[PDB]
């Protein structure tokens, strides 16, 4: 479009998407930590009498 204000909104999204492609991958690190903690919780609380 010839409107710079209209393109300004689409460029604000492309720059946001540009950072989300990177930042949203840290949810994978959160999944790895949570899964590792749940295993440590099961082993630490395992039965021994």
């Amino acid at each position: 479009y010839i409107s710079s204000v209209a393109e300004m909104m689409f460029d604000y999204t492309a720059c946001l998407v540009f950072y989300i492609r990177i930042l949203a991958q840290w949810i994978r690190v959160v999944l790895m930590v949570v899964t590792f903690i749940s295993l440590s919780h099961y082993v630490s609380d395992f039965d021994i009498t």
Binding site: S44, D45, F46, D47, I48, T49
Partner: protein, 68 residues
């Protein structure tokens, strides 16, 4: 054996478990690294008395008899 009566007394080993006897139906077994429960799973509160020695009793009976 029935579930022991709820007793909040416990002793931690590794970390504070915040044991609540009313949070579960059956009391979970005590693990060595987790908790030790209070003594007397099946016990009540009574009042008892020691028995005085036999020679001490005989002198009390002799005093009462000599008194009356």
């Amino acid at each position: 054996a029935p579930n022991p009566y709820p007793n909040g007394i416990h002793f931690d080993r590794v970390f504070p478990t915040h044991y609540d006897p009313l949070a579960e139906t059956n009391r979970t077994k005590a693990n060595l690294q987790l908790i030790k429960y209070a003594p007397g799973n099946y016990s009540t509160l009574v009042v008892t008395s020691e028995k005085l020695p036999r020679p001490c009793i005989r002198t009390i009976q002799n005093y009462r008899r000599c008194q009356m």
